[PDB]
Amino acid sequence: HHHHHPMSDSKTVNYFDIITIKHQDTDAFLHSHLARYPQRYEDGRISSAGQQVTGYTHPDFNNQWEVLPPHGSDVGKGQAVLLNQHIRLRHVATDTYLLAHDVASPFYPTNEEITTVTLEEGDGELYPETLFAFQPLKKSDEGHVLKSKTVSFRLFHVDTSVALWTHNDELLPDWGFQQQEINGNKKVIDPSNNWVVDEIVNLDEVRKVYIPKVVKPL
């Protein structure tokens, strides 16, 4: 009666899941690592000198992010993430929160830098800047369940109203290990701002078992 989902099947994404997030047009994962942005770029613009966030096209521990609810929520396990709810993303390998802010990005002076911040900063003065949403492409899908692989979204920053974006026409220089740049795109409706959740790394037994649906005969 019971079957086990293959890796490639969709599952509901719940709060406290550890997920990877894949960009539709480039197949890159949202990635972070210890390296920091250069203090000053070649054109003289200054960065935040914060932790880099990049796009990386191979499986890696540094692609893993824990999905968290906002402060003051009373959420336990088994609670699905819904489209357009405010969420936070904690980078598992470094224990830092995803953050965007109105600082010019590495290659695009008019797009925003994406970084991560410490727990103390992110749960204190910088909290509002750690809020994102899995924004549905159509507004009527607000409140629908987020599922892996099959549900498109924009990774939307609440405080500055940008959508996280990446590209593979040109890559970061050696300081960014020739990974894809990530930045916050002010042109929210560009279809190149579309992502999915690729994997739920800490999937529980409740969600690995399913009963196959029956195809109706013609």
Author numbering: 322 to 539
Please quote the paper that reports this structure.
Protein O-mannosyltransferases (PMTs) are conserved endoplasmic reticulum membrane-embedded enzymes responsible for the transfer of mannose from dolichol phosphate-mannose (Dol-P-Man) to serine/threonine-rich protein substrates or unfolded proteins. PMTs from three subfamilies form obligate dimers with different substrate specificities and require the concerted action of their transmembrane domains (TMDs) and a luminal MIR domain for catalysis. Here, we present structures, native mass spectrometry, and structure-based mutagenesis of the fungal Pmt4 homodimer. The core fold of the TMDs and MIR domain is conserved with the Pmt1-Pmt2 heterodimer, indicating a shared catalytic mechanism.
